[PDB]
Amino acid sequence: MNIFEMLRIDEGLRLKIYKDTEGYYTIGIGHLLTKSPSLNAAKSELDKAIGRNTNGVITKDEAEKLFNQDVDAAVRGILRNAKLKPVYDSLDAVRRASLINMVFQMGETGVAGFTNSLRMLQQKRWDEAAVNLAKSRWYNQTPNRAKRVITTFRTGTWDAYK
Ligand SMILES: [Cl-]
Ligand SMILES: [Cl-]
Incomplete structure (x- = not known):
């Protein structure tokens, strides 16, 4: 299991414009197009x-291409972020995937906002971090x-995905 397979399970794959959980126009594997209500603005x-x-409509190859770009961009945004980078550097491989997943979903700014949870993860207080992460929209x-x-x-394993 890896970040790609993880995000593919969480996001699904749709080849036709669709609305995400927040009502925003998206396509492929979780690729946000626009926050505007306009379907023409999304096309x-x-x-x-x-x-x-x-x-x-796009093809599977095209969806996978956007996907590869978005994962790359999530990683690069974490490494460029002064608040995220130290966390990421501190984690093992499995947990790093978890942080990438959150950034992919809600953006670097949004994740960087989880101040207390990030501090807990960096300290390796897994149970506490898990409790604090859940108190969130x-x-x-x-x-x-x-x-x-x-x-x-919390576990540092892929059990939740198997
Ligand atoms: Cl859900
Ligand atoms: Cl793009």
Whole structure:
């Protein structure tokens, strides 16, 4: 199991524009297109991301390409972030995947906002971090996915994904 397979389970794969859990236009494996209500604004963003006139549909290869870019970007954003980087550097391989998953989902800014949980993870206080991570809108809005990520942080294994 790895970050790609992990995010593929959490995000699914859809080849046609769809609305995410927050009602935003998305495509492929969790690739956010726009927060605008406009479907035309989303098709425009899509064509721009793909480099062709897609009329709202993409192929599996195209979805996987956006996916590879988004994972790369999540990692690079963590490494560039003064608050995230030290956490990431401190974690083992499995838990690092957990942090990438959160950044992919809610953005670098959003994760960097989990001040107390980050401090707990850096200190390796797994049980405490798990409790603090759950007191969040994130957990309350997408509980099943949040629990899988939190269990991964707590145990350092991929059990929640098997
Ligand atoms: Cl893009
Ligand atoms: Cl969920």
